[PDB]
Symmetry: C3
Subunit: 272 residues, 3 copies
């Protein structure tokens, strides 16, 4: 598919040459082949778009006096940062991701696995959070890679049972999960992709939480298994929030309405 | 002793040359010295065995149309994948590992530490699972690296007390862990190498579980600390399973009795 | 700002050349600018100090027969190991770290974020442990990166409310946390940098524990969220330990009192007063 980098370069490269900051990998070279590129030496934002290969390389680049006139995404990006936030809506494999939303390699993998339908705007997911499905639980075995030994006939009856399974092994037979906007997920959290179809808008998933069922909008869930500890707002305000959907506002609307975003009391007065 | 790649090349290289896909590392070049190798350009499975250096390199390889004649393990492997599954029983730091069994870097480390006696067949361990022992808890200090300041005399006094400690700090004076066959371990799980000697065949360890005691065969454990939630099968069927040991079956046997593998009621009718 | 490597070379390089064991990186070559360095081939501790670039590189070096003449820290180090243990007290992003103390990249990042005041001596932190703060919980939004869209007037109003927030979003307006000496933190543990200011001396944080408030000295905490399960020692010996502070002892004193360190009963007979 189109990587994050490719989506950014299609939007912001603007005919410049890519200055690679770090050791180029084969995956990077494949992504840059539609573009002119070279190993960064002296860089000028009028002439160059800087791609740091790793986050390590970005730290070095941003520590260098040459980076001062380079703006995030517009002039530079990290290649190995497929979950990194962007100022525009993007695709992660074939999952739409909203603005200013970030996540780590586990969620990137879940996006590739087809476990995720969409990730909302202004959503914050700690890099250590994980999303995996259940194996089959209604067979004699729980192994998945046993199937590498299955011939065509055995694999057919095995696959056929996997669909009829109402418990959705490997996320079969279910809708991929929606992760809403203005969502927060802390370190080492886990969401089960066989048994969860929605993390509601505004949900907060605490560190260490193991989420086995849907999280309602603006619920705060903690623990193993994860349980609703409280809601962020009253029922009336949650009702208003889901109607107004400030997370779809334009940048101008976000700034014009900043007092209502900073103050829930002013939000309710204006919209509720 | 031998890395995973070396065990695979010993079995499958078949007089071909190794085509390296990705930037090589010091440890890869050490593993490749007995074999002729070169940087991959054009590759053909009749002539070449493709070694992807990193998991990212493999992703790039399998996206290239040159790869679709290449079979997993038989014609290509990832070097940085010591926990990766294989169609034959292998060694991981002198720990026997069964067919189609995979685990991540934490479990690889525990094998190197001598914490694990063996890992069974068709066993599936999430890459973020961890296995560590306890430090000593019957001394004034809990630190391990204070011993870096111990002269000869102090080290001898410290080691003699560790060796008679019935709680097996650093897994001293206990049997290394057996992990059974048809076992599942989910994300962020932990197993204490000081207090656990067996994960029974068929055991399922839920994501986030913190396992401090042996897990009986076919038990499902969850939580912090881990406690049994349920058993996969009746006591009679568990007895039957531990007798038949389908996980030692030939590939022919697996396909012939695939009906019994997918239907536990057929399994008990045929073998119970 | 000085890397761990530079701090070690400043003390131990002793006029030698750095032999780089592994593929060098941008960050390594910048840290090696003040030094003589070359790609390692044949290495001799008389002439060379070996820097493994990655931990995997270090595994390869230590499997090589040339490495048996090299002592840890004195003659070799890993570049990608900013939280690695050392025989001297060091800085990690302006955070003092005691001797023989180790931690992983999660704690290193917490150091860089300003969340940690100091980390004590002989403290063992699993590499998978994580320390981060809460976002603001008193606004309409919980996102942080929404602020990339704030103009200067919006950002000012946002930052003003964060600074007056008594629950310390992003660790605002609180003391960075102290992590004591002789501390142990297990795999996948988490400490909340918004609501924790002290992990007491001698505390044990079990694997998977989610620590949301201060851990008293020598308490053992487990669970999500973490709860005190037991103390390592009696009240009297905890008082004695906090006074003797053997973790500040010199190498000479540590070996002279090895018996008191190994047997708590002997520790109290000598120090319990
Ligand atoms: C550079 N500082 C940032 C900090 O900013 C906060 O403290 C700053 C200094 O006091 C303030 N100037 C700022 O207003 C305030 O918001 O907010 C945290 C929030 C946390 N979820 C995470 O998200 C990042 C992810 O970790 C990362 O992976 C992703 N790429 C980007 C995310 N923002 O890391 C950032 C980062 O540590
Ligand atoms: C590539 N797809 C796989 C999926 O297969 C399932 O969904 C497919 C598409 O719907 C089906 N065709 C297939 O029959 C079914 O089993 O099962 C999961 C099971 C999970 N424990 C893990 O194990 C992998 C580890 O994560 C990895 O590290 C290790 N190398 C190999 C393991 N299989 O990742 C795989 C992987 O996401
Ligand atoms: C190389 N072996 C070491 C082992 O030594 C123990 O078993 C040995 C016998 O097999 C004994 N000779 C030794 O006396 C005893 O203490 O103690 C553990 C303690 C654990 N917190 C971790 O800490 C390490 C961190 O994982 C690492 O990241 C950090 N750099 C250094 C830490 N010690 O990994 C080490 C490592 O596995």
């Amino acid at each position: 598919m189109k990587t994050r980098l490719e989506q950014v370069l299609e939007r912001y490269l603007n005919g410049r040459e890519v200055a690679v900051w770090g050791v180029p990998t084969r995956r990077l070279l494949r992504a840059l082949k539609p573009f002119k590129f070279h190993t960064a030496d002296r860089v000028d934002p009028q002439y160059h778009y800087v791609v740091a290969v790793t986050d390590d390389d970005l730290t070095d680049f941003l520590s260098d006096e040459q980076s001062k006139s380079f703006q995030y995404a517009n002039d530079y990006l990290t290649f190995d940062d497929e979950g990194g936030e962007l100022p525009f809506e993007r695709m992660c494999f074939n999952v739409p991701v909203g603005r200013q939303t970030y996540f780590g390699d586990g969620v990137v993998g879940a996006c590739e696995n087809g476990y995720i339908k969409s990730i909302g705007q202004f959503t914050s997911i700690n890099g250590t959070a994980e999303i995996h499905a259940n194996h089959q639980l209604n067979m004699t075995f729980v192994s998945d890679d046993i199937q590498n030994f299955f011939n065509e006939e055995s694999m057919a009856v095995f696959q056929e049972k996997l669909r009829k399974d109402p418990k959705h092994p490997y996320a079969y037979s279910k809708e991929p999960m929606t992760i809403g906007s203005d969502v927060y997920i802390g370190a080492h959290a886990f969401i089960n992709a066989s048994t969860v179809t929605s993390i509601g808008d505004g949900a907060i998933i605490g560190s260490g939480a193991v989420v086995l069922e849907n999280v309602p909008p603006f619920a705060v869930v903690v623990g193993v298994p994860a349980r609703i500890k409280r809601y962020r707002f009253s029922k009336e305000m949650i009702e208003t929030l889901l109607r107004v959907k400030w997370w779809d506002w334009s940048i101008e609307e976000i700034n014009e309405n900043v007092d209502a975003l900073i103050s829930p009391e002013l939000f309710m007065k204006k919209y509720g």
